[PDB]
UniProtKB/TrEMBL annotation, chains A, B, C, D:
Any single GO BP term: glucose metabolic process
One Pfam family this sequence matches: Gp_dh_N
PROSITE patterns assigned: GAPDH (PS00071)
Record's protein name: Glyceraldehyde-3-phosphate dehydrogenase
Domain Glyceraldehyde 3-phosphate dehydrogenase NAD(P) binding: 3-155
Keywords on record: Metal-binding, NAD, Nucleotide-binding, Oxidoreductase
Amino-acid positions noted as binding Mg(2+) 2 in the UniProt annotation, renumbered to this chain: 306
Family annotation (Gene3D superfamilies): Dihydrodipicolinate Reductase, domain 2, NAD(P)-binding Rossmann-like Domain
Amino acid sequence: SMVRVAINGFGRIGRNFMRCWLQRKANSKLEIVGINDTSDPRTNAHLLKYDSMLGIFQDAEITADDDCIYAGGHAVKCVSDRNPENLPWSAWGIDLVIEATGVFTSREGASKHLSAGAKKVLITAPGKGNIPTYVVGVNHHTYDPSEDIVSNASCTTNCLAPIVKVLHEAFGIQQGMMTTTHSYTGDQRLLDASHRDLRRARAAAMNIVPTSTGAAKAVGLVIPELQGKLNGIALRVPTPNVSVVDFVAQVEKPTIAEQVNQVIKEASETTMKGIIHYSELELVSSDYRGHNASSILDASLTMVLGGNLVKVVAWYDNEWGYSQRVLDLAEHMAAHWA
Amino acid sequence: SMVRVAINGFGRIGRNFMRCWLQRKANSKLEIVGINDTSDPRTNAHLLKYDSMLGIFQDAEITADDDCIYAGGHAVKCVSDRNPENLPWSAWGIDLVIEATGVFTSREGASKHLSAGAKKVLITAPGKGNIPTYVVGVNHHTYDPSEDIVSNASCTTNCLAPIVKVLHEAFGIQQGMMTTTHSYTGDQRLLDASHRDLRRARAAAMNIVPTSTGAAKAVGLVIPELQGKLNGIALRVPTPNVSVVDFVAQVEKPTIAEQVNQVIKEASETTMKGIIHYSELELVSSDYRGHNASSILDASLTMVLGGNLVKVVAWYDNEWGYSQRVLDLAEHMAAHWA
Amino acid sequence: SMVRVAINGFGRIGRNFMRCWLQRKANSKLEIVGINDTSDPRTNAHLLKYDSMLGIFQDAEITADDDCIYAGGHAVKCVSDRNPENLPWSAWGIDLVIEATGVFTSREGASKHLSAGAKKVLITAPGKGNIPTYVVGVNHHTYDPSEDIVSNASCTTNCLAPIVKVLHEAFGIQQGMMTTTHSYTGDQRLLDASHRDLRRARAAAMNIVPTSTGAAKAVGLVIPELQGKLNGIALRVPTPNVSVVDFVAQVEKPTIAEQVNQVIKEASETTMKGIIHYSELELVSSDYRGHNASSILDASLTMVLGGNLVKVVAWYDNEWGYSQRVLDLAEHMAAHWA
Amino acid sequence: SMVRVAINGFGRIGRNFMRCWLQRKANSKLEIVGINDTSDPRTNAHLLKYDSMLGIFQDAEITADDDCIYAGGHAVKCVSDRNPENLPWSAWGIDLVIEATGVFTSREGASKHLSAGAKKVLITAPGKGNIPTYVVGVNHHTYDPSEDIVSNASCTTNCLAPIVKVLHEAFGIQQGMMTTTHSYTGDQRLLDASHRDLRRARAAAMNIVPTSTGAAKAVGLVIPELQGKLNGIALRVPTPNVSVVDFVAQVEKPTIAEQVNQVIKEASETTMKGIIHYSELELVSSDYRGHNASSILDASLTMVLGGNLVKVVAWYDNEWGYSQRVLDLAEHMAAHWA
Ligand SMILES: NC(=O)c1ccc[n+]([C@@H]2O[C@H](COP(=O)([O-])OP(=O)(O)OC[C@H]3O[C@@H](n4cnc5c(N)ncnc54)[C@H](OP(=O)(O)O)[C@@H]3O)[C@@H](O)[C@H]2O)c1
Ligand SMILES: NC(=O)c1ccc[n+]([C@@H]2O[C@H](COP(=O)([O-])OP(=O)(O)OC[C@H]3O[C@@H](n4cnc5c(N)ncnc54)[C@H](OP(=O)(O)O)[C@@H]3O)[C@@H](O)[C@H]2O)c1
Ligand SMILES: NC(=O)c1ccc[n+]([C@@H]2O[C@H](COP(=O)([O-])OP(=O)(O)OC[C@H]3O[C@@H](n4cnc5c(N)ncnc54)[C@H](OP(=O)(O)O)[C@@H]3O)[C@@H](O)[C@H]2O)c1
Ligand SMILES: NC(=O)c1ccc[n+]([C@@H]2O[C@H](COP(=O)([O-])OP(=O)(O)OC[C@H]3O[C@@H](n4cnc5c(N)ncnc54)[C@H](OP(=O)(O)O)[C@@H]3O)[C@@H](O)[C@H]2O)c1
Ligand SMILES: [Mg+2]
Ligand SMILES: [Mg+2]
């Protein structure tokens, strides 16, 4: 009756997701039963417990042997094969793979998990191609249980799309520009080193690094009305977690900063409760470590010019908040498992 | 015949300005003859030579005694009094004070230098009140030699205003929003500590810190047409120097990214040569250390949506590039010294 | 019954101390009744709650008005006067001042609190001059209840002295060298700026910075046998909290690494329980945030050469661990009050 | 006449080495003719020119096409094969490979270059197994021209061994402990991620990270008298380049700090000229970027206790200084070629 889950890629998102589930395990339809990763259970149990961002895991004991990670008695079988086609998904009765490696985001790549026997794959990133893309709180109720491969979009998409949805329905978004000032991630280089992206090649804790954001295209996938009407970039900066998106929209209905804030506040108390948090506090990025919302609107920073040019600024914990939404999407898939 | 200059406040800008002048001394109408600062000549000579950002000064020898800093034979008299009214400006025949403390930006405050005998004051920051404000390359030819107190605006203003001027004349700027992702400065706190600004209170090398930017108001002072039509914020991040401004404008004439770039490129080769640099390279903040331009347009990041919503992104060395412009303004004042 | 406490200087240590007390308040003989600081209660309440290192305080509500900071319904009266002679210690019935400003470490300075009406002062730093100095777990039982001004030494002294005491009693320390690789503190400069210490003047988050360590002299104060037999330095590095001391000792009784570790482990389970923690885990500085021990021996790093040359390495949370010891010392004084 | 060189692994050391050679190319017996690397010439030309640590290369033009990197009109042929056995060393007439990948440090690994047609290999790291190891200024004159694979040891070995040699000859080193407080390197992880070394797994720019130092064993290889008499560790800290070693020695001849400094100063002016620099200046790590010495003794930090316990502290630019020594060793081999 439980949906048996395997994590492919036990990295920042894979381990954040694991810790999210461990804390919510009592009210879950999911059971994490397997991990595939490039490393071994003892190393991965150590990293699961000792986290530079989340701190030491305290809720339960974490141990390992040659074959398993044990999280408070719960045994998670471990394997290590970079080729998903070889994975023991039928042998372990895996229902859902959390695809968190970053390297199987195409349908062809993610489908290797289906070939190995898994029933469904949830990619923790934008998909490449015609992969259904979901943002919880924006369009996840359109998920169809017949879909075998889905995308939870990116961290920035999950922060920006709920805000855009609210603003679009209140004021009509005609065009919108985004810039996320974003913590560095493991895709960037610690010191200057080769990378397909010549700026992500550059020492990440030393530099402001312009690059792409998945939200530039992904928001238009979860709000189809606005497809082609948004664009923007990322500026990676020397913080290890927590990000903030700056969104400037050309809107149809004239407004003022106060009304924009009130509209988002009301949504955060109703249709978007638990997805958008509304804050009037004068905080900084460290203060949002561990926040469960997809988006925290920083209301003091809202601006409007000429009625139609709206600026909003929203925080997000790109590791933990996004992993909470991966878990929410997986729970939703399990609730609607045909 | 030389304009005798005193530096008040031998900080990041005061010392960057000093090093700018030392490198351009052969073609200068200015002679730096005095320093007032909270510290002593030996400490300040050490900091002038050994700079964590600029490296070790190599062009000439820097030494000191109880009374003077010596920069390649050139003797700079030193004093240490926090109250400008007490300074020896008449006794030293000071013509121009470079006001770089951050604490005398009002007319009443800066005028204390005039009381002490200086003839003119150049504030290295936005002024408080009705202080004439200049950006070299935008409106500095409107300087009037009768003005005894002037402002060189802020680093962000000097980066953004030249770009805005070019865009406004080509496309007509109706409204514009700005966010500078900006290196931390000494006004921020190394660890959490009291500050009039509750976010600048927070550990600067640990945090993304939203705060004010002088450019939100100062661009409208140097381009009067756009007064009240621009607004925006700063996000201070954990880099020690070099900043980048993101500008999203609602424009009257529809355009596309290519045309925006070509317009700025042409200006950078003509009316704005030496003020705006045009770059098609995929660089990061470290690469712009020491750049002399007020603005470096990052052309690969230009975006337009719906013809009328324009996004441009420009780099600036907020210490060195700004200090080059302080020097340019002072040279201009000296050239027009009545 | 309660010893009434005022905090002078509501900085990193003042606020860490406050949070230590708030969490240990049920068994305490201390009542924090007053704060003097350069800032106002609203700013200081904000900083008490929102801490970049400790996270958001959530055990109890924290608020403020013009006169008080409120912590879980406990009203803490606030004043703001840089001269301790002016403080309302008589009117507020202050028994004990926690002197955490960094600028009243001499008897003449700290005694201004006594003139103002306090009965005793606990300096959160090495004293200047003849100030009785204590390290809990090393010599705090020698506390003389007639003393009116005492010192809790420094963070590094509290880490190193317990280990030195154990090693000296087991093996006989003849000489010892120390280097603490130490997080930066607020005494250092965010960007290059004047400082009495020409290296602490230098941008703290981008440099390794050699400087003094208070433990070089203070360990010999709390272990008088070893006066003049130890020396060392600090290397300040770009982490905001948690430090590690490297101690190389020349010992009389020849030993080997296994025996050194066994001796310290046994002490940590008995006479040094709660002061020294013994760890064989392969951890890094982030993992010791919030650790309550004065010293965490990193047993895997113990080395011995030739029988008599002993190297031990010990972690410490220089903000929180030290503040726990400040609280322990204040509680000891309150339990031995005269 | 020229010894034809190929760089294998165009990383931090590969590119620092290239830039060292480009600046010393007029007096060289080496010609860099080829590069093998995991990336392509256009990416690698970009990284060679735009360096976050060294700045923009401006001595000569740097460009690239599908097959070559061009440096000042010098065409450097490029290939990309992770297996050295496949490399075109015979066809390109490669005499000497600079082995800078980090993964061919054993004789079996490095010998794949010889199979491919190179005549000798210089490993830019300690060797694994019986690889002749050299430190310029310590034992490079012992070079045996018949050796086909050699090691230049590590950055810390090159800093520490010259100082150890001078101290041993003057005072007799009986035992010695070392700790290098060391910039992070590309072997560490930007965010917590799997690693054979559970501490190097941890986010490098936000942690103090204890780990191994190659100098613990390698100093005894280049000073055979001291084999087994030294030991130590590294503490990796959040700076991107420049490191400092702390060495505490037990010496036979009793001395004092003044005599230790005099002995090292004299060596730095004579037998160790260009290898050890002697400094009495109060500098920090940023100031030693680009320093050409293997070791900079920070004389102000020298301490002695009891005559026989000696502490010295020495800086080194672990990228650039080490690469200068790689170039020095390669030039020595080219001058003693057989
Ligand atoms: N970090 C964020 O803020 C964030 C937010 C939203 C989404 N995401 C997405 O989540 C994915 C993972 O990102 P991350 O930050 O967690 O990166 P990460 O820390 O590198 O995690 C990826 C993990 O997958 C492992 N791995 C790589 N290739 C594999 C393969 N073929 N088979 C099995 N395991 C493999 C990696 O091992 P190695 O370390 O040995 O390579 C690592 O353990 C990416 O798609 C990323 O874009 C990231
Ligand atoms: N840094 C930038 O990127 C930048 C760019 C453009 C403009 N500015 C503006 O330039 C000004 C200085 O900024 P900064 O970054 O150079 O700061 P800074 O490094 O703190 O420099 C200010 C200097 O003035 C000294 N000082 C303070 N009060 C004084 C007084 N009453 N009399 C004499 N000297 C006094 C300070 O001494 P202490 O260190 O002892 O306080 C310090 O040496 C501010 O207005 C700032 O907003 C800064
Ligand atoms: N941080 C550590 O790891 C550590 C560990 C052990 C001991 N200590 C010692 O503890 C003391 C404080 O260190 P810290 O790191 O907490 O420094 P800090 O963050 O600068 O805190 C000092 C506090 O005192 C305030 N202050 C300064 N002068 C004052 C005056 N005359 N009257 C009232 N308030 C005044 C400061 O205000 P402003 O911010 O306006 O100056 C600040 O709030 C020093 O003796 C330090 O060496 C520090
Ligand atoms: N950095 C220092 O301070 C320092 C000092 C002295 C000695 N060393 C030693 O020098 C070596 C390199 O260190 P580093 O810091 O320069 O490391 P790095 O930046 O990672 O450089 C290594 C280079 O080799 C490439 N590479 C790896 N495997 C390869 C293969 N099979 N064929 C071709 N190219 C390959 C890497 O590509 P990828 O980026 O794609 O992996 C990278 O370009 C190591 O032995 C290191 O211990 C380092
Ligand atoms: Mg199958
Ligand atoms: Mg006068």
